[PDB]
Amino acid sequence: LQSDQVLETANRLRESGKEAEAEAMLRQQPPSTRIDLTLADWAQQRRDYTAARAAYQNVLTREPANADAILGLTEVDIAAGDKAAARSQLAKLPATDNASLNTQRRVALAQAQLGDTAAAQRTFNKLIPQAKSQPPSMESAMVLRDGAKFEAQAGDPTQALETYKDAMVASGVTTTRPQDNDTFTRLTRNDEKDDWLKRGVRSDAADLYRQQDLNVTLEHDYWGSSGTGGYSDLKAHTTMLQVDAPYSDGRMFFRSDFVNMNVGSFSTNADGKWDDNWGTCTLQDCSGNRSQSDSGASVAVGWRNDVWSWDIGTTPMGFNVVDVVGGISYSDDIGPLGYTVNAHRRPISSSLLAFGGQKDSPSNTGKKWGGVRADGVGLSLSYDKGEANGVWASLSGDQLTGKNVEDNWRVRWMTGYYYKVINQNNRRVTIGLNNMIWHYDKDLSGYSLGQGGYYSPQEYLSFAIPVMWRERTENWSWELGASGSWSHSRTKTMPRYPLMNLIPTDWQEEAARQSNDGGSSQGFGYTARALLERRVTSNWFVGTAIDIQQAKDYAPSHFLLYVRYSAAGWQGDMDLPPQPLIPYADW
């Protein structure tokens, strides 16, 4: 056909991006409707709405209600966001016929996004058995993958898993249908030479299988920080047990921790008496509580998915001060920028006084204080398409309050630019720059009565240069890196006992005469973090991680070991990076 030669002439111009214009000047003579539909599809692939509707009018001027044009109109209306117009256009579709599986799949998808699940289910129940009998190809693989996704969204995960297992035969991942979970996970592994459809099938099948599994983890981590014995010589142990069970689209988790806080003993020298900046010992010598240690247990329950997450729990029961923490989060995408808002209630685990609170010596006052809880909101912005760049930012503001402590509030701001030197599937090395600015209304770093004993700089500014190295193989997954930082702090002079209602009347004048001097300091800091994970058998995984914090921010170091149990059995690609259990207080 003469028109066929014209069409292929334009098809030999797709190398240049201006082939649409060339078709436009070529079709200045009456083009009938076949080339019009071809250029309408071309316009649909590149940009939408405006010219798509222009071509809609051009075809509809002299068309006998073509099914493809109307279907494209439905798709455009769904993209535009007009439910009524899209539904009307879908109803305008002609009666069902042979309708080669592609157009049926598009109509079923449009019905799925148009609130017609009661008809989309029937459409896909008719589409899948016929596609199964066909030999392996692209369209059959696409329709099988879309049916598996629809069944996953429908509610039944078993049918989606079966469809995903079958889809590999049509796509070309495997010649024979898998009959066991181990082969399924092994075929979900990534390959450096795969088509887009094959990559998508592997990714979504692996994600669905990981979501639909039972995991049990046990982790014990040793954390602490050097300091003066009695209130700051922190040496703490925590044991956490977590079980992740699938539920609807997301995963439900149950976490239970067991802490053991040991801060040492007072270095008494004045004949069984000590006079340190803790409690009210500087007004009168303290005696009786030479050893300071505590332990407790906590329970956490929550549910999360891709869109929004929430959790609820309590602070470790057994401590001097106990409170009910909580949190919630939401995530979405705006263009190329992703934002994750959240409102959280978290305690401070930097010290025993901040976390569970201490008790003053029975000789002087014998009163309980501490237990700082931060209730605030935060806004985080992320942007990453993942070729040679990455930028993230975050801002949060809390209201630091606690039992028998002075009220305080903070406004933190974190930002960072990370550059991926290697962007391989199994290897990722990132070098970038980090910036952090914090501001606290009141300096409560002292451990005296009325203060929270937590790092609260009035003005903070830190610049860090982190270097990362993420790599994985068949059985090993490790991460090694370091980050040197330069920080500048500036505190202000505050009275030693901001809240004067607890101190005795006799010591009131001397208490007022005592104040905590403020100062400014700057210096270089560094931090080193390493991770390791090894898959021993198909069900049990073991790993460990070491965190070293020397950034002058009084952050304690962390050394953790954990073992993960998988009920189903995962023989697929390892986690990049390995994912240890973050402590509940650190959330």
Ligand SMILES: OC[C@H]1O[C@@H](O[C@H]2[C@H](O)[C@@H](O)[C@H](O[C@H]3[C@H](O)[C@@H](O)[C@H](O[C@H]4[C@H](O)[C@@H](O)[C@H](O)O[C@@H]4CO)O[C@@H]3CO)O[C@@H]2CO)[C@H](O)[C@@H](O)[C@@H]1O
């Ligand atoms: O065929 C009609 C059918 O089309 C559907 O839309 C399809 C497009 O037809 C199809 O060209 C497109 O495939 C893209 C794919 O989106 C890209 O991801 C891919 O680029 C890959 C690359 O192949 C990989 O090697 C590499 O690793 O990653 C990049 C991407 O990161 O390139 C191909 C071709 O350009 O996918 C669309 C979605 O299916 C319509 O949805 C449907 O209505 C029509 O019936």
